[PDB]
Amino acid sequence: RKTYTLTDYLKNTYRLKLYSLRWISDHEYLYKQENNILVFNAEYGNSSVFLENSTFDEFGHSINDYSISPDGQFILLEYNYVKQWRHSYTASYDIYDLNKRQLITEERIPNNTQWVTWSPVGHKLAYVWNNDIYVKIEPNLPSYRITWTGKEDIIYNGITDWVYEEEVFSAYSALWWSPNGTFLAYAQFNDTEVPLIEYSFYSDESLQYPKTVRVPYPKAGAVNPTVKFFVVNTDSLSSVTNATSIQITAPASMLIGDHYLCDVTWATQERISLQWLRRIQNYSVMDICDYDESSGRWNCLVARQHIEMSTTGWVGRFRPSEPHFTLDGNSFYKIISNEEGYRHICYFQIDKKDCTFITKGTWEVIGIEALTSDYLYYISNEYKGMPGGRNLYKIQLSDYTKVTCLSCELNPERCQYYSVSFSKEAKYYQLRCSGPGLPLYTLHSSVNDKGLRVLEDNSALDKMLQNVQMPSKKLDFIILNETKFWYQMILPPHFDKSKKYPLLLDVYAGPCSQKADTVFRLNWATYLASTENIIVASFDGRGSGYQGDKIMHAINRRLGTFEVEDQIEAARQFSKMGFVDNKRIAIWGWSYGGYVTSMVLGSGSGVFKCGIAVAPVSRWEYYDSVYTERYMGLPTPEDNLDHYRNSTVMSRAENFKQVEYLLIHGTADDNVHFQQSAQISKALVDVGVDFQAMWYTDEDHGIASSTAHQHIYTHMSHFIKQCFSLP
Amino acid sequence: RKTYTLTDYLKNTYRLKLYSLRWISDHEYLYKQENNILVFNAEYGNSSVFLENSTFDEFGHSINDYSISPDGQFILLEYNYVKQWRHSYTASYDIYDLNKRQLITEERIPNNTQWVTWSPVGHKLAYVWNNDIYVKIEPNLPSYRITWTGKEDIIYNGITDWVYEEEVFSAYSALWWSPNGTFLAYAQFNDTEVPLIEYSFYSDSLQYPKTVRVPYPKAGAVNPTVKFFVVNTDSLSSVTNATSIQITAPASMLIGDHYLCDVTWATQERISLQWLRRIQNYSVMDICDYDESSGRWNCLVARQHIEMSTTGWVGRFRPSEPHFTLDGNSFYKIISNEEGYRHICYFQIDKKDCTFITKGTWEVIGIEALTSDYLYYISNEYKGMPGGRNLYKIQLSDYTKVTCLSCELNPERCQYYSVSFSKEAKYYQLRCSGPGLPLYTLHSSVNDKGLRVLEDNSALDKMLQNVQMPSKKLDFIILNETKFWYQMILPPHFDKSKKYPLLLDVYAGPCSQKADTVFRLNWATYLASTENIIVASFDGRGSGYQGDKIMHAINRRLGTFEVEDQIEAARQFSKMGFVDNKRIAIWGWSYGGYVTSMVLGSGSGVFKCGIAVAPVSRWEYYDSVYTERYMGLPTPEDNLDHYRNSTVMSRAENFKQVEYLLIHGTADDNVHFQQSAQISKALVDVGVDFQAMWYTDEDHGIASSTAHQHIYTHMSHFIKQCFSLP
Ligand SMILES: COc1ccccc1N1Cc2c(nc(C)c(CN)c2-c2ccc(Cl)cc2Cl)C1=O
Ligand SMILES: COc1ccccc1N1Cc2c(nc(C)c(CN)c2-c2ccc(Cl)cc2Cl)C1=O
Ligand SMILES: *[C@@H]1O[C@H](CO)[C@@H](O[C@@H]2O[C@H](CO)[C@@H](O)[C@H](O)[C@H]2NC(C)=O)[C@H](O)[C@H]1NC(C)=O
Ligand SMILES: *[C@@H]1O[C@H](CO)[C@@H](O[C@@H]2O[C@H](CO)[C@@H](O)[C@H](O)[C@H]2NC(C)=O)[C@H](O)[C@H]1NC(C)=O
């Protein structure tokens, strides 16, 4: 029997199959098999080829992706795709008319389009081009311009800027159609006085002079972008007149200082909900805006507003939660931290004050997945008191106490981690367990939660894994001060609790993180355990999430304290286990995990012989406002300046004398600037500490290009193996 | 028994003593001692104290340097010193009156001045501030503004842009007083269309990285342009501006891109100007006379001196300096002869051709002084050792009477001299650099009598007798019937029966020389003494001081023979019985780093490992003046093919055969970090693993105290590992 080797991991020799589908109605869904796009009936399982992979053989461009209009009539061909940041990019587009079997050839969508999206019904298009918004009521009709103010790196209409893209919307898009198709709401961003990060991009050998990349990026404390909201009426567009935009002013509690627009959710055809958050993320407001057919304007009755405060920490897991509106848009449901700081579901009625908790307990609700008039379906880590497990639940809207678990028992030994995808109106649902066994895709009717069929069992991957000495995962918990904190171990094949093994500590450790879970990974850690017999361990300590505010907020205004502290205490416990050679304990982490890995190696605990830190953060003034200020406040003497400076990696350099440290960073990192690792290395040199390094030309935070990804794991494997006297 | 250790190298435990004097007339010099400035009498040797080490204890500023006026009356005080490039910087200046014994506080020189200079006689000042030239006739008086066009990073008056500073003048200054103090000649640089090198500077507390921007022509890019001006300082109105008379380049230059590469005043009214075509194989020397009548300066086309070259470029790194006889009507300069050896040549203004006054299989290194009877020069004639330097004189009245002034002084200890003459050369200080400890002595020119010893380094010698120092061998091998010299730093108690690891120390750039007789205490010393590594260097094809046939071997084909030859030399060292061919490393810095890369990437088979510090990776990345000299232009009609065939990136597959360590500073304004960034990327892309280290905010020199200590420690760890050393 062969082991799970580094090549296996880098070459992706053992692939996980997936069943990713798109619900197209209350009972159909699309699925792409062999580059053929098929429609499926959910009740019966029958299918028809909707678009045959042969269809576009003579197109003249590699087609990167596709989007089909809600009403099945047209399809968008995305090509010439060029990636910008995490979510943002630009591309070329073409539209194919189905019931005509041809390409619309005039009023073509412009090249270098930054965003496109169908109205939720029919076949309208909104697109963003040169930071300006455009609308095509019909695919071959000339589009109407919505905004004229757009300017590169300065004014953003309909798309986010760098920090809203990354920290607020987790999307490039800033465009929300009304469920109807009538209204197109859009955000607008002004970065006029936001400071630029600048770095060299070397590009192909053939480029003589390096290019300097300039990106508006507010470092913690810096001037943030400002934001405006507008709603356009897409029916009354004059080919003759400029479309007129109605602005929705932020609440007064917001305009008294820096604030972010943090959520946009349409409730009815004529009601829109806007959520806002203060620059100090202590305090958010939900506005509710109704449309006046007489006026033509939108009004956010002040008395309607819902206010969300937190005194122990910040608001939300990462942001104020999403509202789930009932059909008549007169009520809605929202995840809220309860009186014991455990996150639960709340029932809100519009024009009533306060709210009602429909769930409670020492566990947390991850998400609301579907609403009907009888049932709310949600995900949570309640089952078997395991914070790292996930299940599908429904609660009777008529009787809160009548809560039933849909996923808990389907395969209790293979599946303890599910996510879900419902059809419109919630007739059917696809479940997806990620572990601890192989991933399993199942379909279900909602009427009597009966299993219709298996969609993907990963039988093939299972077969392969037979011939391989796979490692196992333990998932237990230690006790620190009469509290449970969870941990996972990727044990080597043929594990023996008598023999001593070297242990690599895998950390991320960031606010609301979770590294001990029941999901099945094939990763580097897998190779390390299978082939090199290394026990790779992860631990969720103070500040980790999904265990209520007590734990997750321990770290508030104090990054680089308990979570660092606890990665170390955890290690201690781990030597006390009779199979850990404590002379061979490494640590390593990426991004936030790298900041932590560095603070650990620099603490002097003596526990760790070595570690790697990949694209770490080194000083919180170097990271972005929205994320950093969320946990740290502002870096001023009036706020939290002291701990900002007490919490840097540079100030710990001396102790790095005690360990072999490897430091890695991509030169093109637009997120955690190479700066951060530059300052780390300088501090080390300025104090005479040897250490090892490796920079990656033109790689970003992900160091995810094929070559680079191969190279970095290779380099890191060499380092760990050397550090462990491994053959 | 102790060895020369890394800590010794880095903490400067065994200090070389020096003797740096500043000739201030024909028979006195100046010398710093307990931070006391002494004046010494050359003939007799007596000294008195010229500046008390207590004079400015109340200055409220750390003094960087001093500069005494020609006439002895005033002294300049450099403080607030801020380094820029290799020669340029800024500082504050105060002028101290010696007769009055006080600080002139009227019409002071501005903070952030870019350059200052006394006239050659008298006590005039020329300074450059905000890229404009100013002139103070008297210390206390208002300055006069000569230029008005100065403009940061665009218009340079009286100072050089980046590439002139580094590659052309080896100086920030572009001002040249006439011998009188009457005329001020300056040059002017326009970098308007010169592209910018951009990089980050991270610095300290600083939230956003700073982006640095330097006009910097890479190979083939738009070069700066140059103009030349002369001003009459005697006639400066406090009311009207200052007329600057322009001298224009010859027409054989204006056709296209050219450089002003030399400015030499011959007399009070004759200026010598050298110009060089951007294709550096042709240069014109103009001779320009003043006209008391017309004011203009005229360069008779009739009397131009023209230099061409078929086998290479003109001069060693540039056309050579002319040394005019006092009357200004003849001059001497070093010129390649019929068999391509560089000897001294006598030129008469208005007569064709020149007359060689020296010949032979060796070369003149430089012309040191000129008197009515003798010309003094340094050469490597003695013993036919190209890596030796000796001082000579030749009787102007009989070219065949040539006297060696240094050879026999101490033939054992002293085979490498430099010289410093007094104004007029009644005396000279000889300076010996090896192979023994450095020796500083003084001599009278009258009949070359030895006057006294100045520094003999006895202190150091005594300290070193306690340590197991390495010895140095210096020899040659023959390849294809040619002698190629090399040296080795050999471990103490060296035992030819034993086997040693061998580290090839490489530079190897055109006209370089790594095998000489100089005495050094450096990293290679520690490697040999403590770690018992043989550190070797080899002067192969392309190296200097041995005639054009070797030095031009590399013309338009950089990254070929100098590399091949480095490789062959290492083969030849294995052939010698004391090398363990299983442990043979290679390292170099700058041009050395590039060569070290090409070698490692040759799939030679010979090198187990190597380190490259701030290497070049492809020649288009490097500066125009330097690169276009050896390579021509990177165009299809010129030498673009070999530009393309001579990069490091293209040899990346071959590195899967070596342990490679690549190092470079982030703020390297000279060899841009770029070059390394492109190397690593090529290695990532082909799957080759390799070690690396960057240095935040270090330049080409990586010479800050911490950075310096850090890299040498790091590089030692690497070499010890590569050689399995305990
Ligand atoms: C599983 O998490 C990881 C695992 C491994 C690498 C990176 C990740 N990270 C880190 C991360 C991710 N996603 C977002 C949106 C953000 C916040 N911008 C962040 C983030 C959070 C804090 C700091 Cl200091 C820097 C960064 Cl980049 C992500 O996926
Ligand atoms: C024996 O020389 C060294 C020995 C050791 C380190 C540096 C040096 N170098 C290299 C060097 C030096 N001085 C000048 C003026 C120049 C000209 N650019 C250069 C130079 C030459 C070629 C290339 Cl590719 C790049 C550079 Cl920087 C110097 O001292
Ligand atoms: C983006 O915001 C900037 C900064 O507020 C605005 O620029 C200012 O405009 C007003 C009126 O023109 C004046 O205060 C100044 O002349 C400008 N100040 C600055 C800093 O430039 C700008 O109007 C905004 N752009 C948009 C599209 O709203
Ligand atoms: C420096 O050089 C630049 C061009 O290299 C000169 O600017 C040009 O000069 C002409 C004539 O004055 C102008 O019409 C153009 O606008 C300029 N062209 C460019 C490319 O800018 C400039 O005059 C020179 N300055 C000095 C002091 O010599």
Ligand SMILES: *[C@@H]1O[C@H](CO)[C@@H](O)[C@H](O)[C@H]1NC(C)=O
């Ligand atoms: C295209 O579709 C056919 C089925 O009609 C399929 O069998 C074929 O392999 C597909 N080719 C691909 C994967 O592009």
Ligand SMILES: *[C@@H]1O[C@H](CO)[C@@H](O)[C@H](O)[C@H]1NC(C)=O
């Ligand atoms: C499924 O089967 C029925 C019976 O033919 C048919 O009406 C329907 O169109 C089929 N659905 C799909 C998705 O092909």
Ligand SMILES: *[C@@H]1O[C@H](CO)[C@@H](O)[C@H](O)[C@H]1NC(C)=O
């Ligand atoms: C709309 O406004 C734009 C920009 O202000 C202006 O150019 C134009 O007059 C308006 N469009 C039309 C044609 O009415």
Ligand SMILES: *[C@@H]1O[C@H](CO)[C@@H](O)[C@H](O)[C@H]1NC(C)=O
């Ligand atoms: C959609 O809603 C708006 C406002 O409710 C209305 O003006 C428009 O006519 C509606 N269109 C449809 C699809 O009925």
Ligand SMILES: *[C@@H]1O[C@H](CO)[C@@H](O)[C@H](O)[C@H]1NC(C)=O
């Ligand atoms: C437990 O309590 C001790 C003492 O109060 C404290 O130092 C330590 O950090 C605590 N550990 C945890 C994880 O709560």
Ligand SMILES: *[C@@H]1O[C@H](CO)[C@@H](O)[C@H](O)[C@H]1NC(C)=O
């Ligand atoms: C040297 O001695 C002579 C004779 O005393 C004296 O006049 C002269 O000033 C002395 N020079 C120095 C440098 O002290």
Ligand SMILES: *[C@@H]1O[C@H](CO)[C@@H](O)[C@H](O)[C@H]1NC(C)=O
């Ligand atoms: C130099 O700088 C300092 C800054 O305080 C200033 O006080 C001083 O006057 C300056 N000298 C000149 C020449 O202005």
Ligand SMILES: *[C@@H]1O[C@H](CO)[C@@H](O)[C@H](O)[C@H]1NC(C)=O
């Ligand atoms: C130097 O030479 C120039 C040549 O024209 C002359 O005018 C001037 O008077 C001389 N200066 C001195 C100091 O003798």
Ligand SMILES: *[C@@H]1O[C@H](CO)[C@@H](O)[C@H](O)[C@H]1NC(C)=O
């Ligand atoms: C010796 O000759 C061969 C070709 O005959 C050549 O490859 C090599 O470069 C020569 N070596 C030297 C140092 O000239």
Ligand SMILES: *[C@H]1O[C@H](CO)[C@@H](O)[C@H](O)[C@H]1NC(C)=O
């Ligand atoms: C974009 O450029 C393409 C080439 O990919 C060209 O054929 C086309 O005309 C452009 N598209 C539009 C709609 O501007």
